[PDB]
Motif scaffolding. Structure first.
Motif, PDB file in Angstrom:
ATOM      1  N   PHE A  53       0.895  -1.192   0.143  1.00  0.00           N
ATOM      2  CA  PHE A  53       0.018   0.054  -0.098  1.00  0.00           C
ATOM      3  C   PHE A  53       0.953   1.301   0.133  1.00  0.00           C
ATOM      4  CE2 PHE A  53      -3.859  -2.155   2.115  1.00  0.00           C
ATOM      5  CZ  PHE A  53      -4.200  -2.525   0.962  1.00  0.00           C
ATOM      6  N   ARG A  54       1.954   1.321   0.957  1.00  0.00           N
ATOM      7  CA  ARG A  54       2.531   2.508   0.936  1.00  0.00           C
ATOM      8  C   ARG A  54       3.617   2.651  -0.348  1.00  0.00           C
ATOM      9  NH1 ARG A  54       4.593   1.635   6.778  1.00  0.00           N
ATOM     10  NH2 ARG A  54       3.035   1.819   8.118  1.00  0.00           N
ATOM     11  N   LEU A  55       4.132   1.711  -0.746  1.00  0.00           N
ATOM     12  CA  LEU A  55       4.890   1.776  -1.747  1.00  0.00           C
ATOM     13  C   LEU A  55       4.287   1.914  -3.109  1.00  0.00           C
ATOM     14  CD1 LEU A  55       8.064   1.104  -1.672  1.00  0.00           C
ATOM     15  CD2 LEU A  55       7.602  -0.928  -2.975  1.00  0.00           C
ATOM     16  N   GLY A  56       2.927   1.738  -3.176  1.00  0.00           N
ATOM     17  CA  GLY A  56       1.958   1.945  -4.384  1.00  0.00           C
ATOM     18  C   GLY A  56       1.615   3.524  -4.421  1.00  0.00           C
ATOM     19  N   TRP A  57       1.394   3.987  -3.061  1.00  0.00           N
ATOM     20  CA  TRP A  57       1.250   5.468  -2.956  1.00  0.00           C
ATOM     21  C   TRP A  57       2.352   6.281  -3.098  1.00  0.00           C
ATOM     22  CZ3 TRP A  57      -2.962   8.387  -2.558  1.00  0.00           C
ATOM     23  CH2 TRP A  57      -2.811   9.772  -1.987  1.00  0.00           C
ATOM     24  N   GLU A  58       3.774   5.923  -2.711  1.00  0.00           N
ATOM     25  CA  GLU A  58       4.734   6.361  -2.819  1.00  0.00           C
ATOM     26  C   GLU A  58       5.090   6.535  -4.457  1.00  0.00           C
ATOM     27  OE1 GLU A  58       7.932   5.187  -0.457  1.00  0.00           O
ATOM     28  OE2 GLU A  58       8.006   6.724   0.731  1.00  0.00           O
ATOM     29  N   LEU A  59       4.998   5.310  -5.135  1.00  0.00           N
ATOM     30  CA  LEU A  59       5.300   5.323  -6.401  1.00  0.00           C
ATOM     31  C   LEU A  59       4.257   6.294  -7.351  1.00  0.00           C
ATOM     32  CD1 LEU A  59       6.084   1.473  -6.943  1.00  0.00           C
ATOM     33  CD2 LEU A  59       7.671   3.397  -7.249  1.00  0.00           C
ATOM     34  N   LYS A  60       3.046   6.558  -6.775  1.00  0.00           N
ATOM     35  CA  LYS A  60       2.424   7.312  -7.577  1.00  0.00           C
ATOM     36  C   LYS A  60       2.719   8.808  -7.270  1.00  0.00           C
ATOM     37  CE  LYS A  60      -0.934   6.425  -9.221  1.00  0.00           C
ATOM     38  NZ  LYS A  60      -1.344   6.404 -10.577  1.00  0.00           N
ATOM     39  N   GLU A  61       3.062   9.091  -6.177  1.00  0.00           N
ATOM     40  CA  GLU A  61       3.709  10.447  -5.864  1.00  0.00           C
ATOM     41  C   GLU A  61       4.935  10.685  -6.815  1.00  0.00           C
ATOM     42  OE1 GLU A  61       2.024  12.733  -4.316  1.00  0.00           O
ATOM     43  OE2 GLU A  61       0.826  11.827  -2.908  1.00  0.00           O
ATOM     44  N   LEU A  62       5.783   9.691  -7.090  1.00  0.00           N
ATOM     45  CA  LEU A  62       6.956  10.034  -7.759  1.00  0.00           C
ATOM     46  C   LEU A  62       6.511   9.955  -9.341  1.00  0.00           C
ATOM     47  CD1 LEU A  62      10.057   9.947  -6.769  1.00  0.00           C
ATOM     48  CD2 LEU A  62       8.313   9.017  -5.117  1.00  0.00           C
ATOM     49  N   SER A  63       5.392   9.128  -9.773  1.00  0.00           N
ATOM     50  CA  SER A  63       4.911   9.368 -11.117  1.00  0.00           C
ATOM     51  C   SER A  63       4.260  10.862 -11.358  1.00  0.00           C
ATOM     52  CB  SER A  63       3.966   8.299 -11.385  1.00  0.00           C
ATOM     53  OG  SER A  63       3.025   8.372 -12.556  1.00  0.00           O
ATOM     54  N   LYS A  64       3.860  11.478 -10.243  1.00  0.00           N
ATOM     55  CA  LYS A  64       3.291  12.732 -10.273  1.00  0.00           C
ATOM     56  C   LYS A  64       4.483  13.922 -10.486  1.00  0.00           C
ATOM     57  CE  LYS A  64       0.026  13.858  -7.410  1.00  0.00           C
ATOM     58  NZ  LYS A  64      -0.888  15.191  -6.921  1.00  0.00           N
ATOM     59  N   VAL A  65       5.568  13.539  -9.750  1.00  0.00           N
ATOM     60  CA  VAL A  65       6.533  14.624  -9.766  1.00  0.00           C
ATOM     61  C   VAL A  65       7.451  14.334 -10.897  1.00  0.00           C
ATOM     62  CG1 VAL A  65       8.844  15.234  -8.413  1.00  0.00           C
ATOM     63  CG2 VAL A  65       6.500  14.760  -7.140  1.00  0.00           C
ATOM     64  N   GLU A  66       7.944  13.105 -11.247  1.00  0.00           N
ATOM     65  CA  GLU A  66       8.970  12.756 -12.256  1.00  0.00           C
ATOM     66  C   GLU A  66       8.170  12.720 -13.452  1.00  0.00           C
ATOM     67  OE1 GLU A  66      12.539  12.620 -11.991  1.00  0.00           O
ATOM     68  OE2 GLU A  66      11.896  13.312  -9.714  1.00  0.00           O
ATOM     69  N   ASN A  67       7.908  13.938 -14.198  1.00  0.00           N
ATOM     70  CA  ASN A  67       7.092  13.892 -15.449  1.00  0.00           C
ATOM     71  C   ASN A  67       7.514  13.079 -16.710  1.00  0.00           C
ATOM     72  OD1 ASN A  67       5.255  15.622 -14.309  1.00  0.00           O
ATOM     73  ND2 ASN A  67       6.497  17.577 -14.720  1.00  0.00           N
ATOM     74  N   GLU A  68       8.689  13.096 -16.745  1.00  0.00           N
ATOM     75  CA  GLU A  68       9.181  12.347 -18.045  1.00  0.00           C
ATOM     76  C   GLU A  68       9.232  10.734 -17.644  1.00  0.00           C
ATOM     77  OE1 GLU A  68      10.639  14.884 -16.393  1.00  0.00           O
ATOM     78  OE2 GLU A  68      10.812  16.582 -18.105  1.00  0.00           O
ATOM     79  N   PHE A  69       9.726  10.472 -16.649  1.00  0.00           N
ATOM     80  CA  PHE A  69       9.526   8.807 -16.279  1.00  0.00           C
ATOM     81  C   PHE A  69       8.291   8.719 -15.522  1.00  0.00           C
ATOM     82  CE2 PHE A  69      13.983   8.004 -16.730  1.00  0.00           C
ATOM     83  CZ  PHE A  69      14.733   9.487 -16.962  1.00  0.00           C
TER      84      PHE A  69
END
Ligand SMILES: CCCCCCCC/C=C\CCCCCCCC(=O)O[C@@H](COC(=O)CCCCCCCCCCCCCCC)COP(=O)([O-])OCC[N+](C)(C)C
Ligand SMILES: CCCCCCCC/C=C\CCCCCCCC(=O)O[C@@H](COC(=O)CCCCCCCCCCCCCCC)COP(=O)([O-])OCC[N+](C)(C)C
Ligand SMILES: CCCCCCCCCCCCCCCCCCCC(=O)O[C@H](COC(=O)CCCCCCCCCCCCCC)COP(=O)(O)OCCN
Ligand SMILES: CCCCCCCCCCCCCCCCCCCC(=O)O[C@H](COC(=O)CCCCCCCCCCCCCC)COP(=O)(O)OCCN
Ligand SMILES: CCCCCCCCCCCCCCCCCCCC(=O)O[C@H](COC(=O)CCCCCCCCCCCCCC)COP(=O)(O)OCCN
Ligand SMILES: CCCCCCCC/C=C\CCCCCCCC(=O)OC[C@H](CO)OC(=O)CCCCCCCCCCCCCCC
Ligand SMILES: CCCCCCCC/C=C\CCCCCCCC(=O)OC[C@H](CO)OC(=O)CCCCCCCCCCCCCCC
Ligand SMILES: CCCCCCCC/C=C\CCCCCCCC(=O)OC[C@H](CO)OC(=O)CCCCCCCCCCCCCCC
Ligand SMILES: CC(C)CCC[C@@H](C)[C@H]1CC[C@H]2[C@@H]3CC=C4C[C@@H](OC(=O)CCC(=O)O)CC[C@]4(C)[C@H]3CC[C@]12C
Ligand SMILES: CC(C)CCC[C@@H](C)[C@H]1CC[C@H]2[C@@H]3CC=C4C[C@@H](OC(=O)CCC(=O)O)CC[C@]4(C)[C@H]3CC[C@]12C
Ligand SMILES: CC(C)CCC[C@@H](C)[C@H]1CC[C@H]2[C@@H]3CC=C4C[C@@H](OC(=O)CCC(=O)O)CC[C@]4(C)[C@H]3CC[C@]12C
Ligand SMILES: [Ca+2]
Ligand SMILES: [Ca+2]
Ligand SMILES: [Zn+2]
Ligand SMILES: [Zn+2]
Lengths: 671, 43, 671, 166
Positions: free
Chosen positions: C189-205
């Protein structure tokens, strides 16, 4: 609890007998041979017995391609029936050759080895079967009514249809057309056309005949694709029994054959006869050359009329120049029709200067249409589907001329139009002339085919007009129904035209009235309600019948909801679904239509645009050589593509397992 | 360095995609049969 | 002619050296061993040399899984570097174990064996690597601003991003979460939420972080799927560090975890607490029971107020009964709002009987909103997105009450409304009351979630409103632009209201005038032009400025073409494309929204509908046992599914070829 | 159903009428809501039929009046606004209450934007998505319906068409 048993009991095998079949499955040659020579003496093991899954020992050996146990069983004289067909379906050339050299069945009784080979489409096995003189029975006519066909249909219609379908699937084999055919291209053409007709007739078996016709068309396309030189291409296209085979392909609607890139290239280099470098030119110089030729059509036409043997006389015999001259003449005709709208109280007046110019193009159009009729014939004339509106234009022009002549002869005076009769011949003539003007100006849709960016668009319109025609039946039924209901309610309150404020009756007035008084006016009102031009107060009467008003208003509302909200959005969804089915083949269909338009200009007949139109065994032998090379190339190509596609199943894994196990028992025997 | 990495990557991706036909099965069948006649000859 | 050469030349191999590598490729153990012992003496063959395709002898032995030549090369001490990683990527457990027991590279320098194993997601190899104490470095914060992160970003931003991405792909491994995690479900759960936040921040990746988050969500869903009893399901859902883990899953937006069939079944049997057999009932008896409960909400409410400990007092604490009571009270509120529209000249009148009934529901709605505020908190309140319009309703009701009180205190007389002021407090109050009436009546969209056939429809609307919002920016830009142009043309011919036939100015008159005189009126006119309610003669002036008229008319025409023909059909195409992307996950999203609506009624707070609302290591150990069984079941299931999917490449064929060839040289050696 | 080229078309209509029925609930909710709001604003300015130029009251007159005076007439007016037959000046009163006019006009505008721009295009997208799910099995469903129609005529009962059956 549910008891489980075997409600359809069969004969079980004994222990030694199951052991024998299991030894056949693992491929122990020593055990199988020992069991056979023991059975020959003791008569304990049945060699022709069945298994739990429908097979016998020869069937297992055939499916496991183990030729050595298979020939051992052949030497021990096991049952042979239908194992040849099993080897045919298995596509094992060694099994086929060995069974040629010498109950329950999953094949229909009509299945013949040549027919099953034609289904499998394996060139090797089909050729080995054709080496022996083997015959396929001829299918009868599409609409045959002979005693044998009606008796076979009456006795068992399923077996008759399955037999006909089986024959046609055998005949449509690309390998069986590549061999045993004097002309594979023409054979594929005729077979595709016949399979299309059987698809049209046999409604239930439609998809399989459609896919067989598509397979024949694909075979013809690939056979043309395998050509490797421009001479071979032109020998194929110019064979006759010019461009005779191309005209045959156009007649049989082989769009895949016509849309071949090499055939389109040859047609293009015939089309741009006068200009060798039109392929590499700029847009501006192409437009300048097109306008330059288009502004000189009367000069080129009178040059052809005076002297065909000159630099300008035969310049219009080139196809592109002829097309440009026809288009330019027709555009000048439309320009004059536009000018014609630019004293008006004379009853039946003489034709003006513009109409005196228009009359020879009208005569030339009529003469060209009847000349195309007399030259081409009847089916070719009615097949075009543009000649219908061409006939409409000619009929309306002739009616306008006749009414104008009648008015000019019968009337002489100058009476103002305010007191003319409502059915006056001049008024009828001018209405018909305007209708013919619209038909002439929408005749230009046919010229979108020759353009690169508008042709597929015209094809998409021609394919979505069918769904519009399908929807129009339902819409017209709803229109007739609601018109009937609104008439039945509102025709008691019909008012005279005199009682109106400005002596106008109908929905075309300033104040709309009597929208549902007669059936014609109700149809007009409920038609105009679609575009919002019918106001709401047409559902009103002078009397205070509020319930009558409310029922009429909710009838109008129900009609609007059915038409604009349901039916119009249904039409949008239907055309959106239909467009995606056309977008894939739009290129091929456009290339076919443009080829037809190009071949329409290749003839010497109809050269002059209006109004100026009223003023030999070596060929067979070379074709046979080219087709022989084509068949060799196609068989090599389809063998390579059979050895390039996926093609692999668990048959291959059990084949390798059988080889490994047979070897395993071999080396356990030798060591 | 880019060309070396790209050739290595496309070799790896050629050895990661489907790539297999009945050529491979008849190749293995040929190897098995050639070996079979070899050991039938040697024994 | 184009010369061809090798512009990037390398070092070629000698004949014996190519022979040695070819012997390694075919697997001749005798030849390879002989070449090694000859090289040890003569130093003629380089054992660590390269091939034309990037590999060495150990790499060939590893990729060909030939463990015996691989261990021979290990015993002869060939170069070892990165061959461990090659065996990790190759997924060969024997090669991994042997290399654990003891230039150019296609791996990044950060690649560690545990990280490459986590990428390969092979449970066996990951567990053998985890047996040794091996560490993965911790990624920093999402928005970390420390000196190490800014230095790594400045020095080489590609290597920094690749390293972070490599760490997160290692951590998101389902096997690496199945092991080495005290709580795999919460970790996912926490890893999915964190990966969603990094998806929002890192636009190119973006896509790779999105797919890693989706992989974590799928892992959590399958881990819940592997449960096999209702106790294990409720231990998973009720673990806390009731329904604590379910509330955590709702907080982290794990729609796949929430929409599990077993979790939905448990939520349903908690939802239908009072009725055990609602699952199997007829439509008519369900409707009758719903209306029966809905007609008794004041009785149940006053029963709870009087005595909670009774057959009727605690009957409203059941979730379905509470939901029905809330819906029935709110529907009676809307019925009273409808009744409120059924002397009118009193300035600031006393509230009537209907408004005197409405006032306690208004107070109860405000009290419930502020109570939800005070109980839940701030982020939970603003996250709902329905509380915005709820706040709008409460503010408009409060403004209506305040204006009504001000009017009642300040005004006493009875003046007819024809001469009232335009900003009169009574008029403002009634306008605000009508706006609040509309907001109250569209608040019912939130109840479509609980229905089976309307919930996915509401989800589809909520997903297409985003594209409508996207299109509204472009449309409003075009509207502002054309309003500016039409104002700049037409504001010289502004006419006073007195000069008009009926003293009316604007497009809301009988005769429409001055449609483009001011900016507000131009915006209104070009808005109403979309629906056809603006007539054509609003582009007319009294003077004879025909060029001015024509430019204004073609501006209006260009605006109509841009809006109705281009932009509206663009909006249709955009929502049609967007609907297909939502139709697949509409079921899962609806189940998530309905779960949120169900859990909104599980609390004791907010039990009374308005207006009545104003009147412990064993748990950890059992959870650990359940998760251990779940991890064993999931690893077994994903091993079975790895042995059930396609999975096969030409690696397998060359593996079998290598085995056959190695055996071949073996028996040629032994014989 | 008995025709080859119209049967699957009838099946497609019978399968998209379900989505029209689904959309009708939301549209009728919006219609009821905006009718309630416009009534609550405009029912103070109700005028008698005698005061009108031609003794006609309602949106079915030459000059449209009192479109939001009663609930029935407000429902009729906001229904007819979908097809454009309701003119803009029905949001007008005799008095000079310009703020009252502006709030009524923007309520009418919000209803038109919700209905014609959002909801109607939503219905178009929904039926377009639904048609593709039916186009695959339309042949099978049409053959089933035509089989039912054929078996309806195989019985001896109901042989005589009316009026010969009495
Ligand atoms: C494809 C379908 C065919 C298309 C081509 C048809 C060519 C037809 C050509 C025939 C033209 C005859 C003109 C009338 C002369 C006779 C006459 O006196 O008329 C009488 C009746 O008049 C009418 O009824 C008017 C008929 C108008 C037909 C218009 C067709 C338009 C098709 C548009 C298609 C798009 C005059 O009234 P009365 O008797 O004095 O009283
Ligand atoms: C989400 C966004 C927020 C939504 C909730 C906002 C709640 C707001 C509540 C505040 C209500 C204040 C009422 C006016 C009292 C003051 C007054 O004398 O007004 C003066 C000015 O009057 C105006 O300018 C009228 C303002 C009407 C606002 C309507 C908002 C509708 C939102 C619909 C949204 C859909 C009177 O004129 P004068 O001074 O005499 O000259
Ligand atoms: C009293 C009433 C007065 C009314 C006055 C106004 C009348 C206006 C009438 C307007 C009619 C307009 C018809 C336009 C049709 C355009 C068709 C575009 C698509 C198209 O190319 O269709 C072709 C079919 O032919 C066709 O579609 C031919 C259509 C012929 C229509 C004839 C009408 C008479 C297909 O192309 P293809 O035929 O080459 O395809 C290969 C061979 N099948
Ligand atoms: C002087 C001017 C006078 C004007 C008088 C007339 C005014 C009329 C105003 C009409 C406004 C109508 C708004 C209706 C919105 C319906 C939305 C339907 C789709 C839907 O459920 O949207 C939800 C978002 O919330 C929302 O969409 C909340 C919308 C809140 C709008 C507030 C307006 C104030 C998504 O659902 P979810 O939020 O549960 O999704 C999970 C959590 N993200
Ligand atoms: C004071 C007010 C005055 C108003 C005056 C005007 C009234 C106008 C009313 C117009 C109503 C029109 C209804 C037309 C329905 C057409 C349906 C087409 C599609 C279709 O075939 O639908 C069938 C369902 O039956 C149906 O769709 C049956 C619909 C029955 C409607 C009954 C209305 C009363 C499906 O075919 P199937 O039923 O064979 O499918 C297999 C068995 N399920
Ligand atoms: C295709 C052929 C088959 C079609 C089958 C039927 C489809 C649905 C037909 C629905 C008809 C509704 C008629 C309503 C009516 O009488 O209005 C006129 C009249 C005009 O006075 O309406 C009334 O008197 C009632 C006022 C409220 C009407 C609410 C209608 C909500 C739904 C509107 C349609 C969807 C947008
Ligand atoms: C999205 C934002 C970017 C949009 C980019 C542009 C899109 C295309 C715009 C086309 C505007 C055409 C305006 C025509 C005009 O001036 O008409 C008013 C005026 C009214 O007098 O028209 C004229 O004066 C000329 C009469 C003939 C007009 C023929 C127009 C044919 C095409 C119509 C549109 C397609 C349907
Ligand atoms: C489905 C159910 C939920 C729907 C949720 C909402 C959807 C979006 C609603 C947008 C309403 C806009 C109302 C504008 C208004 O008050 O106009 C009437 C009034 C009429 O006076 O407009 C004004 O007073 C302001 C003039 C400028 C308006 C600009 C509007 C641009 C966007 C138009 C819509 C898109 C095309
Ligand atoms: C529709 C608007 C722009 C008013 C103009 C009406 C006509 C003057 C236009 C409309 C359709 C046009 C035709 C559309 C397509 C073509 C094909 C075009 O030929 C090609 O595409 C060139 C390449 C080739 O022929 O191989 C020659 C011009 C022509 C007849 C166009 C001539 C001018 C036409 C009749
Ligand atoms: C839109 C037309 C028909 C005018 C009627 C307006 C209202 C009276 C309707 C419109 C929306 C309806 C609601 C839509 C959906 C539901 C969910 C429904 O619950 C279920 O689906 C039952 C199963 C379950 O709750 O588990 C209970 C009725 C209710 C609140 C409905 C109550 C009646 C409402 C408010
Ligand atoms: C819609 C416009 C053209 C006005 C005409 C209205 C009616 C006179 C039409 C509209 C629908 C038509 C029906 C549509 C379909 C058929 C099926 C058709 O039968 C077949 O398809 C033949 C093959 C077979 O029955 O097996 C017989 C005519 C009939 C009843 C049609 C009869 C004439 C109808 C009632
Ligand atoms: Ca013609
Ligand atoms: Ca709330
Ligand atoms: Zn016959
Ligand atoms: Zn940091």
């Amino acid at each position: 609890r549910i008891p489980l048993q075997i409600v359809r009991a069969e004969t079980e095998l004994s222990a030694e007998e199951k052991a024998f079949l299991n030894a056949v499955e693992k491929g122990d040659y020593a055990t199988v041979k020992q069991a056979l020579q023991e059975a020959e003496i003791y008569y304990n093991v049945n060699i022709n017995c069945m298994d739990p899954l429908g097979r016998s020992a020869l069937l297992i050996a055939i499916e496991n391609e183990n030729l050595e146990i298979m020939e051992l069983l052949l030497n021990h004289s096991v049952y042979v029936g239908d194992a040849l067909l099993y080897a045919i379906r298995k596509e094992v050339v060694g099994a086929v050759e060995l069974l040629l050299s010498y109950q329950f069945s999953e094949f229909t009784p009509d299945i013949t080895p040549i027919m099953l080979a034609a289904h499998t489409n394996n060139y090797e096995i089909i050729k080995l079967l054709v080496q022996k003189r083997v015959t396929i029975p001829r299918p009868h006519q599409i609409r045959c009514n002979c005693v044998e066909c009606v008796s076979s249909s009456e006795v068992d219609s399923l077996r008759h249809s399955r037999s006909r379908l089986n024959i046609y699937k055998a005949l449509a084999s690309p390998s069986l057309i590549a061999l045993s055919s004097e002309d594979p291209i023409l054979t594929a053409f005729r077979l595709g056309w016949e399979l299309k007709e059987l698809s049209k007739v046999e409604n239930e078996f439609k998809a399989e005949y459609e896919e067989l016709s598509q397979q024949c068309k694909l075979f013809a396309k690939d056979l043309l694709d395998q050509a490797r030189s421009s001479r071979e291409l032109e020998i194929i296209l110019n064979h006759r029994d010019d461009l005779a085979k191309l005209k045959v392909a156009i007649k049989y609607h082989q769009k895949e054959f016509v849309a071949q890139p090499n055939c389109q290239q040859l047609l293009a280099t015939l089309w741009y006869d006068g200009f060798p470098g039109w392929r590499r030119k700029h847009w501006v110089v192409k437009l300048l050359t097109c306008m330059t030729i288009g502004f000189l059509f009367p000069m080129l036409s009178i040059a052809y009329l005076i002297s065909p043997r000159s630099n300008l006389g035969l310049f219009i015999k080139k196809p592109f120049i002829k097309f440009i001259c026809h288009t330019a003449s027709y555009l000048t005709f439309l320009f004059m029709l536009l000018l014609a709208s630019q004293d008006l109280h004379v009853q039946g007046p003489p034709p003006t200067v513009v109409e005196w110019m228009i009359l020879p193009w009208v005569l030339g159009f009529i003469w060209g249409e009847i000349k195309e009729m007399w030259d081409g014939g009847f089916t070719e004339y009615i097949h075009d589907w543009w000649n219908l509106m061409d006939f409409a234009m000619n009929s309306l022009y002739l009616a306008t001329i006749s009414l104008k002549i009648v008015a000019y002869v019968k009337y002489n005076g100058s009476r103002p139009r305010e007191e003319w009769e409502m059915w006056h011949p001049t008024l009828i003539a001018e209405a018909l002339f305007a209708i013919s003007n619209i038909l002439s100006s929408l005749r230009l849709i046919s010229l979108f085919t020759a353009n690169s960016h508008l042709g597929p668009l015209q094809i998409s319109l021609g394919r979505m007009l069918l769904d519009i025609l399908k929807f129009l039946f339902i819409y017209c039924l709803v229109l007739l129904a609601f018109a009937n209901g609104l008439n039945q309610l509102y025709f008691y309150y019909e008012t005279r035209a005199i009682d109106e404020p400005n002596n106008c009756k109908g929905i075309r007035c300033e104040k709309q009235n009597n929208a549902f008084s007669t059936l014609f006016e109700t149809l007009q009102s409920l038609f105009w309600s679609v575009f919002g031009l019918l106001n709401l107060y047409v559902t009103n009467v002078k009397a205070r019948h509020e319930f009558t008003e409310f029922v009429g208003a909710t009838m109008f509302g129900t009609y609007n909801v059915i038409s604009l909200v349901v039916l119009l959005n249904m039409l949008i969804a239907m055309m959106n679904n239909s467009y995606q089915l056309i977008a894939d083949h739009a290129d091929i269909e456009w290339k076919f239509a443009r080829t037809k338009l190009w071949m329409s200009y290749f003839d010497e007949g109809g050269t002059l645009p209006p109004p100026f139109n009223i003023i030999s065994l070596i060929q067979n032998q070379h074709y046979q050589e080219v087709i022989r090379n084509l068949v060799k190339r196609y068989v090599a190509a389809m063998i390579r593509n059979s050895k390039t596609h996926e093609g692999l199943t668990e048959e291959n894994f059990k084949e390798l397992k059988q080889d490994i196990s047979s070897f395993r028992y071999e080396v356990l025997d030798l060591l």
